[PDB]
Design a binder for this molecule. Structure first.
Ligand SMILES: *[C@@H]1O[C@H](CO)[C@@H](O)[C@H](O)[C@H]1NC(C)=O
Ligand SMILES: N[C@@H]1[C@@H](O)[C@H](O)[C@H](O)[C@@H]1O
Ligand SMILES: [Zn+2]
Length: 1015
């Protein structure tokens, strides 16, 4: 295995180093506003060295943005595809590329057989070429790598089945900045080339000056370079026709033949396109070839890529004709006039890359190596696109919930083959497709119109229900005696109980387990653990009595704690935010111990009085002028007091101290150690009253954040043996710190209400001497070093926080893990901050045509890990990566892949079993089974199950590795006949494995295996 910590890769371009050196001056470069006046030697090309130009027609089709997926399909995309089919059929030299398989699959399945065959033909013959082949063109900032892979797999599996093709070139012209997670996944999925566009204008200038726009993009830790993927960065401001022919959009716009008037389009530079004729073609060709030759100066080979398209282009037949006929005339003239030394033609993306690599092999060019990322994007001036790291945070959180549900449903149901009547494959396909759709760069990003966000939400809700159905059918099958099992595939044997989605104070949707002597004495509950190691975790359920005790299925008592059910209310009479306790339901909490990739059953039983193994939390309400808080049968009376500082410790874990406002002020790791200052604070950013306004995309603050005025908030302290918490009702946020004996959990119920033009930030203030350095993750896959740059505006120093961030000095690290992607930064030494929600009255001039005024309450979840790191083996100061400790990684897993909880629906579960998976190997802590998916339906004689294995890299800090078992995924199901290593999409076999054993992967590596079973 490559060492990902101790060897700093030697690359030609390292983006953090580049950023440190660059001046980022925004000067007027002339017609190329963000560049310079490009000059070329006309003698560079001649009969023996011609410029080869590939004009690549395309149409950018957003799966939801200003209209829903279905609205766009009906109004635009179905016509684009139908007319592409006709025009490509009729014009054999015409070409077209297509990216979004969600639309293509929608279209294809509605075609008659004759048309399906015609479509297959234009694909087989290379006229229509799929690029990337994902369900969508995903966001790269907020998306989790597991869902980037999911959507890629969904689109490519469809393409392989119906089109018999698997793209090896990726096209990402629109995500708002670019992540190295993409080449990581693509290179492990058979790709050879990728194209990107939305990178900071200063980066395009810098790389263009050095002809470093094409590069071998490797991972930041990759010393050897095996992760490298050839990448083409487009050089100009947009992918539209005015910004793709060459540096001068006033000239290039004249070659967008849709802009002459009848289509309702024009050229903002005031010179319209002109129909190409024999009398003007020489002049028109001389203008166009000059643009091409200027663009070609920015690249190393004699092969030039000219995209020809824009949003929802190539709809009408008249549009196909106007572009095709005019370009054909230009090509005939240019290619016949030796003096140009150009050969121009319609091409596809693969054709471009093939020709570039032919030139490379001919010794014509050598390409630079590059590592790093391309955040945070700015398209112009100080307009940094860091707002979408937070926009519509309810749905960003929902994404992570559904991510987990999809994994759990696919894994739970993979253990068996299912009858078609069970509709398992149908429900899983629906859930995968809706989650995949949301990865779109206007879905998870929060940059779509309100009604489109509602569509995505409704789709995701249906997907959650689909996952629940599959999960609960699976649990019932896995834990019922086989000769008793008698499934009704429409029936709900269990309901899922989720304590953190939509969340307390968001939706009152959790079911109470109703027990009573005259109704039902006891209830079975089941926990699932999707991770491949034994896990203990506190779990909680609502019950109708405080007198409840827990047993395992060997009837062993389990220690439990009962607490009240507290809900916070904005009292519009008293103008306070305060908690109310239920007098009819209670929370019971206990530790569940669950096998790797397994299930464990427990029983909740009512009694008439306090059970031996159940304890009761105390509750203390801190506020002046208190009033009573009755709690029904709950056996401990609520206590009252004036606001005061408090301190809490659960088990042998950290001691946390809180301000009189209920906010953390210090953490003491052990009995002897210092009380380390760690202060939570809430602040607000506003919007500028002159110049550019923040909106869904852009964060344009009117200066540093100002503290939220807290008043005298009400603080609730619950103290228990197993779990304690401090909760406070702040303006716009019910903030909770929960302690279970290890790193605390933070929950924020964020309701920005009607606070217009406000962004609420949560900041941590510490003494850690972090300087200008901090670390943020990329897609939940890797941590990248960031350097705060005071030469850039505040909004440029904001980065995506898709799963965590940390600061550290020689001795101390503070890591904040997240259960939802949000934007954040470290704006001063010792600080971390993460945005909670933003409500913006104005549009930000990127075409969305609305502000962000559709906020809804969201429950954000976090873990906060303070650690000593002086003994850890860390990368050198020059290394661009950072790595989590074991505790921080486990804390992240606790947020993203918690135990699933099931409540048996009926009164009695006949044939119930106590456990599943007790014999499953408990793998080393850094290894995950990211995906387990049965790939075959029940009628296949050879069943196949696919696994994606990911090994992270955890810091060595002197905690001896304990004995763990080797995980061989190929032997998880019986009767294995074959084990193959595959691409991550499972679509290509790469290696037939000796002894049918799937080897574990190296740190930072991801591998896929398929096991075949003869049953
Ligand atoms: C799928 O593509 C391959 C190209 O190598 C071809 O051999 C195979 O016959 C194709 N399958 C079809 C056309 O059904
Ligand atoms: N190019 C446009 C982007 O700026 C929008 O967010 C939509 O994705 C649209 O495609
Ligand atoms: Zn788009």
């Amino acid at each position: 295995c490559q060492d990902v910590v101790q060897d700093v890769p030697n690359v030609d371009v390292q983006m953090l180093e580049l950023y440190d050196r660059m001046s980022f001056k925004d000067i007027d470069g002339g017609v190329w506003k963000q560049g310079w006046n490009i000059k070329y030697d006309p003698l560079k090309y001649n009969a023996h060295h011609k410029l080869k130009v590939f004009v690549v027609p395309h149409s950018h089709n957003d799966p939801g943005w200003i209209q829903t997926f279905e609205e766009y399909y009906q109004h635009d995309t179905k016509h684009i595809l139908s007319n592409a089919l006709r025009h490509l059929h009729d014009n054999p030299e015409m070409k077209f590329i297509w990216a979004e398989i969600s639309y293509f699959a929608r279209f294809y399945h509605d075609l008659g057989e004759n048309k399906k065959l015609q479509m297959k033909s234009i694909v087989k013959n290379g006229q229509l070429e799929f690029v990337t082949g994902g369900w969508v063109m995903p966001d790269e900032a907020n998306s989790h790598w597991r869902n980037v892979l999911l959507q890629l797999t969904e689109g490519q599996t469809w393409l392989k089945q119906f089109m018999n093709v698997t793209p090896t070139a990726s096209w990402a012209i629109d995500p708002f900045g670019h992540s190295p997670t993409m080449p990581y996944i693509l290179q492990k999925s058979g790709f050879k080339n990728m194209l990107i566009q939305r990178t900071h204008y200063s980066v395009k200038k810098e790389l263009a000056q050095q002809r470093q726009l094409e590069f071998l993009w490797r991972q930041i830790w990759d010393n050897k370079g095996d992760t490298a993927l050839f990448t083409h960065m487009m050089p100009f401001y947009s992918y539209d026709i005015p910004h793709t022919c060459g540096p001068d959009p006033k000239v290039c716009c004249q070659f967008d033949f849709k802009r002459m008037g009848s289509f309702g389009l024009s050229c903002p530079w005031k010179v319209p396109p002109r129909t190409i004729s024999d009398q003007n073609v020489a002049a028109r060709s001389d203008l166009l070839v000059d643009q091409w030759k200027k663009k070609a100066e920015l690249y190393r080979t004699n092969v030039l890529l000219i995209p020809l398209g824009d949003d929802f282009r190539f709809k009408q037949n008249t549009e196909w004709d106007v572009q095709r006929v005019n370009y054909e005339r230009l090509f005939e003239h240019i290619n016949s006039q030796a003096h140009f030394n150009v050969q121009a033609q319609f091409g596809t993306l693969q054709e471009y890359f093939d020709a570039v690599h032919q030139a490379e092999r001919a010794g014509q060019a050598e390409f630079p190596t590059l590592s790093g990322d391309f955040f945070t994007y700015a398209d112009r001036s100080d307009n940094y696109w860091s707002g979408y790291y937070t926009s519509r945070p309810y749905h960003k959180r929902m994404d992570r919930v559904l991510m987990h549900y999809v994994r759990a449903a696919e894994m739970l149901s993979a253990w068996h083959s299912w009858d078609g009547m069970a509709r398992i494959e149908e429900r899983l396909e629906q859930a995968r497709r809706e989650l995949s759709l949301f990865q779109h760069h206007d879905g998870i990003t929060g940059t779509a119109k309100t009604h489109v966000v509602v569509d995505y939400e409704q789709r995701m809700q249906e997907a959650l229900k689909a996952c629940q159905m599959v999960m609960q059918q699976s649990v019932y099958r896995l834990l019922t005696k086989p000769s008793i099992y008698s499934p009704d595939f429409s029936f709900s044997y269990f309901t899922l109980d989720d304590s953190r989605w939509p969340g307390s104070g968001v939706e009152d949707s959790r079911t109470t387990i109703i027990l009573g002597e005259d109704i039902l004495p006891s209830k079975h509950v089941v926990m699932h653990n999707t991770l491949p190691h034994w896990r203990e975790q506190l779990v909680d359920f609502y019950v109708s009595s405080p007198f409840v005790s827990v047993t395992d299925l060997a009837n062993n008592p389990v220690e439990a704690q009962v607490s009240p059910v507290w809900s916070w209310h904005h009292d519009t009479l008293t103008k306070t935010i305060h908690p109310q306790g239920s007098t009819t339901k209670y929370r019971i909490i206990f530790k569940a111990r669950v096998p790797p990739m397994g299930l464990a059953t427990y029983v909740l039983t009512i009694s008439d009085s306090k059970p031996e193994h159940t304890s009761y939390a105390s509750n203390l309400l801190l506020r002046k002028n208190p009033t009573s808080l009755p709690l029904g049968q709950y056996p401990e009376d609520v206590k009252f007091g004036d606001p005061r500082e408090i301190s809490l410790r659960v088990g042998n874990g950290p001691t946390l101290a809180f301000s009189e406002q209920g906010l953390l002020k210090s953490i003491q790791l052990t009995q002897d150690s210092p009380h380390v200052p760690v202060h939570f604070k809430f602040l607000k950013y506003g919007v500028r009253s002159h110049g550019d306004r923040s909106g869904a995309y852009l964060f344009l603050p009117n200066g540093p954040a100002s503290p939220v005025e807290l008043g005298q908030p009400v603080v609730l302290v619950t103290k228990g043996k197993l779990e304690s918490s401090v909760s406070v009702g702040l303006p716009s946020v019910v903030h909770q710190t929960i302690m279970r004996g290890g790193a605390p959990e933070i929950r924020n119920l964020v309701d920005i209400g009607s606070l217009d033009n406000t962004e609420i930030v949560m900041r941590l203030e510490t003494h850690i001497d972090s300087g200008d350095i901090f670390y943020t993750d990329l897609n939940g896959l890797q941590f990248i070093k960031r350097r705060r740059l005071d030469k850039l505006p505040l909004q440029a120093n904001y980065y995506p926080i898709p799963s965590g961030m940390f600061i550290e000095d020689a001795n101390t690290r503070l890591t904040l893990l997240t259960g939802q992607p949000l934007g954040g930064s470290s704006l001063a030494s010792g600080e971390l901050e993460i945005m909670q929600d933003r409500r913006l009255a104005s549009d930000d001039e990127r075409g969305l045509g609305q502000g962000v005024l559709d906020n809804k309450p969201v429950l954000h979840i976090y873990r906060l890990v303070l650690e000593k790191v002086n003994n850890c083996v860390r990368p050198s100061k020059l290394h661009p990566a950072g790595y989590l400790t074991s505790a921080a990684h486990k804390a992240s897993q606790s947020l993203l892949d918690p135990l699933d909880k099931f409540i048996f629906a009926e009164n009695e579960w006949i044939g119930a079993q106590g456990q599943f998976g007790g014999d499953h190997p408990s793998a080393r802590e850094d290894l995950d089974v990211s995906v387990m998916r049965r790939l075959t339906k029940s009628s296949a004689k050879t069943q196949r199950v696919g696994y994606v294995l990911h090994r992270t890299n955890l810091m060595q800090c002197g905690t001896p590795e304990e004995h763990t078992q080797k995980l061989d995924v190929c032997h998880l199901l019986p009767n294995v006949a074959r084990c193959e290593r595959t691409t991550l999409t499972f679509l290509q076999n790469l290696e037939h494995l000796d002894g049918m054993v799937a080897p574990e992967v190296c740190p930072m590596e991801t591998a896929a295996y398929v096991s075949s079973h003869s049953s």
